[PDB]
Ligand binder design. Sequence first.
Ligand SMILES: [Zn+2]
Ligand SMILES: [Zn+2]
Ligand SMILES: [Zn+2]
Lengths: 71, 149, 1168, 105
Amino acid sequence: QLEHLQSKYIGTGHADTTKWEWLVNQHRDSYCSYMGHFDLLNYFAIAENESKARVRFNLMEKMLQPCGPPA
Amino acid sequence: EYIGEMGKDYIYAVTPLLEDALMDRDLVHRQTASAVVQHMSLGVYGFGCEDSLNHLLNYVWPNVFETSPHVIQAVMGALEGLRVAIGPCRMLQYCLQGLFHPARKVRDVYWKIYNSIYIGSQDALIAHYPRIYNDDKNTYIRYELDYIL
Amino acid sequence: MFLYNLTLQRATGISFAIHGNFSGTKQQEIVVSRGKILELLRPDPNTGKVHTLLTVEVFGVIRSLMAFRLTGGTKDYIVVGSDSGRIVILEYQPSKNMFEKIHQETFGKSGCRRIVPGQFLAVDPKGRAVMISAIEKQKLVYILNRDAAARLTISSPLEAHKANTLVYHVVGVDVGFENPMFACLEMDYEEADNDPTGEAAANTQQTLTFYELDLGLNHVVRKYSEPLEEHGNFLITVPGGSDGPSGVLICSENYITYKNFGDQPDIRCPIPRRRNDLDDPERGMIFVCSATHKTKSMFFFLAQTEQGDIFKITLETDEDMVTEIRLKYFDTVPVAAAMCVLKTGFLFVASEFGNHYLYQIAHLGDDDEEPEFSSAMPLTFFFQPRPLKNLVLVDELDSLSPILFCQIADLANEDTPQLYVACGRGPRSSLRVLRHGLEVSEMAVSELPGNPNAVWTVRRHIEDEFDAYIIVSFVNATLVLSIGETVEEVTDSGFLGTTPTLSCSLLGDDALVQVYPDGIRHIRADKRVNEWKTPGKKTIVKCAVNQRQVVIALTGGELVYFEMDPSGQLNEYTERKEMSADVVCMSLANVPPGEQRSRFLAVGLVDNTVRIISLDPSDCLQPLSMQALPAQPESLCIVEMFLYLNIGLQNGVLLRTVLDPVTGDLSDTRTGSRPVKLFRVRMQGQEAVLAMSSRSWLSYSYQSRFHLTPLSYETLEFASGFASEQCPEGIVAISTNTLRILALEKLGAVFNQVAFPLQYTPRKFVIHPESNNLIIIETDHNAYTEATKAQRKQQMAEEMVEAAGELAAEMAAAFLNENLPESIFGAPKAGNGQWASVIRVMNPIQGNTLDLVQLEQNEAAFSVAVCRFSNTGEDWYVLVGVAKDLILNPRSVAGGFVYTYKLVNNGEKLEFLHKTPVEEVPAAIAPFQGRVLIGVGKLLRVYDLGKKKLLRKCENKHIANYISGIQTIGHRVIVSDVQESFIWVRYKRNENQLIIFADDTYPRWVTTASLLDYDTVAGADKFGNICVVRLPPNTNDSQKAEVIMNYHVGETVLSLQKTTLIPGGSESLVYTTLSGGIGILVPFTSHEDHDFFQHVEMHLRSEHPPLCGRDHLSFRSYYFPVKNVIDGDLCEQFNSMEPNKQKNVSEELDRTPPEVSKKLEDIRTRYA
Amino acid sequence: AKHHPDLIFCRKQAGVAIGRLCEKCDGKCVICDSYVRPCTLVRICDECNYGSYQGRCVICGGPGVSDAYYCKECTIQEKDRDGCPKIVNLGSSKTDLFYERKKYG
RNA sequence: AAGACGCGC
RNA sequence: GCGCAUCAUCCCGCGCCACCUG
Ligand SMILES: [Zn+2]
Ligand SMILES: [Zn+2]
Ligand SMILES: [Zn+2]
């Protein structure tokens, strides 16, 4: 009966979790990992003629509601 | 379990025995085989012995559909060891087969296995995630990874 | 199949910065963190130069870094938050010159997780508590205290978790000896995901949450929740307490907001903009970095905008109420990730890209001629940018962090490969040529006819700062020169020597010794000359020069020992040395500081044997050791840091024998096979040795490591030193029939570079086969071309003329006459789908260009290559991939074009021939077998040259995703998919079809591929992984390839090549990363060496953990498990630990530290 | 712990103190009950260590004589970066054992 | 003599 | 009700967690 650690974690699905929740969790994890990794953030800031601060600001705003509105 | 990393040379000698034990004959045989696989996977981790570990997983995997708590625990331990040895990519590939199966029990077991995989070593699944085509109402494609320099 | 990982160049880009007194003294020091390297460096106020003092690798990703100190203390500690789920507090020990761990507390799992703390770190200004926060749902608070033993203590973490919330920034708030206070930009999103109407973006405002820390109750509680009008970016800590009022500044879009707890009214002030902005007015303006200066008299804040404008923020306040915020324009600097304002009027700017500068503040500009702004002014603001006035540039640090493309080739006349790197971003982009060796300075040229064998310099004083007498002696002539700030011939030398001078040194205060093959002379100011003639008709070969030791070597080995008594006269000992071999070279040891005579002394022979002569009177002029040599000795010298000797022979060798009567370590390397003479040089006021050969080499030892570096100059027959007030570090290294003076200004340890400025950032470039010219293509997103910029400027001029401001609008001529530099003031550009493209041909030797081609405003250049076709003759055609209407965030492209050029006149100019429309963007250009491969989206196409456009030949629609690079060899090609690892395609020429026969099973976002054999391909990863894939030998041409090697460098890799670096060496897999680091991979030549290296690595991992508490095996097995790779970073760091553990592991490996270090350096000196 | 599924862990934030083990549980691992390769120490939470609970065995609850440790496999499996590994339940077997011993003793 | 778990005649 | 099988499962003889008491 060691399911306490399963329930006490945020970001994992369960029996009747739909596709939208899984995809938004994936997008949030991807954004957080992008922010954590310096090399990928530098690559993104090199790809576009912008600054790292602006890139991370826009990425933070993208965390509000990814994958459109819920259905 | 005792020898640890030194026993990577003896992996090939026990593969036929593990294959014979993993056959659907006795539950205790399956539990013992799963324990052996988990212990060997933990021992030889980090030295590049995936060739036989993948073959062992190919026979260990069909044992997930069980009801006895002991064999479930043994199978979960074996799959956790195989995950920490091979990597989360192969585990995600295997668990993606029936994440949305029409039936309920297979969906439940696949979801619990996916949760167990996702709890540990989450930072690699982002690279191991597949590509999902977006619908006409929602966006499901990470366009940031398609940038080319 | 086992490779050894090395690192030739460390990472240079700076991600974080901090300053403080980390050594316990009044001297300020700067601690900056690289991508995965933590190093300490401090500037010198007297000269303005910056020198690194310590550099270590943490084997982890650093997400935060800041310093703090306890109340009443004098030392500042270091706190770093890594990807591992633990926090560590560091401390710098000046005596040990290393970081000492003081504490280590674990609070969660490792890795960059969403709900694991480590992203945000806050420290209380007074230095009593530290707060660590995560991206979502997690927050922890720790208590810092000092026990009765004056040691740091750590308390238990505090529960401060809030479900379903997002945190933007966390920073401490000064309270002034009250309970510590923390403020964060916490906001909720629970209702965002519960609304199906799509109103989540609307009616959702940020909140400024405040958190106490009650020491009495030992718990944390939320204080307020104030909604914000607009989204903020980051907060500023205002120095509170007795010096200034407590508060926080909020940076947002075009506004700055001041807020404080209690009854503090909000203050707003718009951010000033430039005059006649060339960017899009709809684009907002934000802040990228900020600094502070907590001066006791008055504090002020410095901030930088997106375009690099520096604003001096001055806060005007009453005793307890804030009145207004006064902004003022200070200067303009390149955009910097972090900025630190140092004491004693020094400012350090850690630029985001390119070199890092160190400005010096001279004038504070308090109420200058330029008007200042304030929040009390009703309604925007405009200011006119000006060149650098307040700041003065003093010193800058060279950097090459944003490398996008690297190629190595021998494009020069010398027989040494050169490293060409394409780095930089935007207008600051430049092309650098990395060359192995040392810096060469040229300031004096003197062509003197004759044969100058050597030059001797003797000072009139024992430690004279300026040279007095210079012995410019030729092979068949004699001359003397002197320097007195006017280079003129000296007359009172009084030498009277016709035969060439053997040697001249400083025997005493001004005692010069002249040796000629027909006797012995003496030079002195007083009438004290010990002139002696050569016995019989014999000759003298070599003489000994030292402070108080003189030994003359004649034919037959008859040595005469001269000892200088304090009286002054020279005396000969009763014992003489005689053998059957002559003496051709010998060296002497420096006099001990306390003793009047040393003991170590080595004299060579002709029979390939070297002996040791004791200077003690008990056994003077007696042999000590019988050490044979492979070749005839040529020179010898002693190098200090504790004592080492270098042995020179007839061939090119340099044995680094440890100080011992009998030979110990035998480590020699090639320096062909020219005679080598060893002489002392100057390097940061130290002692070193020099080797002369067909190419000269120099050896130096900085912090217990010896590096061999050559000189980037022609062959030199002799060299000497030079001391002066302006240039204390001077080298007089004459050459064949000429005189040359060298100097060592910078360190120049490895890869000296020259800066060749560009216009836009470079993507790819190629090298002409016979013309040896570089064709570089540049492209930027959201950019304006020259024609578009001119049209926009003209339109603005017409608009302001039509404004008709009183007819009196004559400012158009002045506005159009002056244009701000793009490199210094930035490039004013904007848009959403704008692009640029410039085709440039540049001569590698010089910085001049040959031709420039400009395309339309909405064309982006991606790939370029040069090849020939069978239908045409030997003309070298150039194909450039061009994209049309490319939008990045939403994937949608209208089309693409491909260009064709002739490149007539040995690649000096380009002529347009025709263009061919392409439905999608062209990915890469791959020419083979007289044709080219065109990457069109997910379709593979084969094109042939025609009369007006390219002709379609073959198609392949079996590729799923978009191609991102094609490589060809033999009769088969490989396709690198954006998601899939690799695709193997074989071209059936007879059938004229493309068939796929092999593919990989593990997807990966590959960026650069570099095949190693007919069936082995090595490719990089976007996340920073290096893998090698080998095709099974039983393949037929379904079949799947297998991976044989995996590794995680930790930084994105955009370059991969397998070419030799050092002449006479072996092939190595050199790679360059996006962070500015260069590394190579070394195969193992024996099983015993591989076993020893693996055992050493395992023992170091078990015994010496990384500084940030991250598992080395887990760090290397980040995305994929490590496979057949041995890390050399731990092996190199083994030389930095204290002796106890290294010796202990030495007997644990049944070996000894000296030969272990020798084996470690053998790989470095063999493959690099 | 592993053998008896009834026993559960408090799973609270780890503190600064170090747990202890009795003579019977001297070498047992706090999770998988193994006597192989003890590498890292065991941290206890503030609630589990207060007053009388100080110096008590983590697994059973006897007097503390030796420090607890984590095995090599547990460290590899990243299982030590979790909550407090102290059992708060008293175990079903112990109650029945004590009752029968008191009856027949 | 004891805490749990699963296996059919 | 029979025959079984698994968990280096228990086999420890009594323990002690703020208290009784005019
Ligand atoms: Zn116990
Ligand atoms: Zn606990
Ligand atoms: Zn364990």
